[PDB]
Design a protein around this ligand. Structure first.
Ligand SMILES: *S(=O)(=O)c1ccc(C(=O)O)cc1
Length: 145
């Protein structure tokens, strides 16, 4: 299995699925490195973020657990197709990249925070991460190139 995939059992249904402990992605199908990748992300900050402030909210007060629940809801609506990743990043990302639909441009290793970097480089093109934790907050990462 590609980098960091394991076989697990759905707790609710009992069907097997695949989980990636680097990206925190999970999927029902058997899963299908470059010098540079390009990603967008959607950041949700919380009271313990390195800088608990964003363009959206001067004083970010939500708990890490509340931030994780918001991230989980966004992932749900993105996966269902009710919402676009780009639309949710634009409206709700606690990052200045919200104005660019979460786009961060391309980058190589050695630039981003390590958990973010590892997830970015373990994603396949077009693939989306699960919740990814950094000192900034909680990210959803979409690898675009
Ligand atoms: S699974 O066992 O791969 C799995 C269980 C729970 C989570 C979670 O995000 O709470 C993810 C994967």
């Amino acid at each position: 299995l590609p980098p960091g995939w394991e076989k697990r059992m759905s707790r609710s249904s009992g069907r097997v699925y695949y989980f990636n402990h680097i990206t925190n992605a999970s999927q029902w199908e058997r899963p299908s490195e470059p010098a540079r990748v390009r990603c967008s992300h959607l950041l949700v900050k919380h009271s313990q973020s390195r800088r608990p402030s964003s363009w959206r909210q001067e004083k970010i007060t939500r708990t890490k657990e509340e931030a994780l629940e918001l991230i989980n809801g966004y992932i749900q609506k993105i996966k269902s197709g009710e919402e676009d990743f780009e639309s949710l990043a634009s409206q709700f990302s606690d990052c200045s990249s919200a104005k660019a639909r979460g786009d961060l441009g391309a980058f190589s290793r050695g630039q981003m925070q390590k958990p973010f970097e590892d997830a970015s480089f373990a994603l396949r093109t077009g693939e989306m991460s699960g919740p990814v934790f950094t000192d900034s907050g909680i990210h959803i990462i979409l690898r675009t190139e």
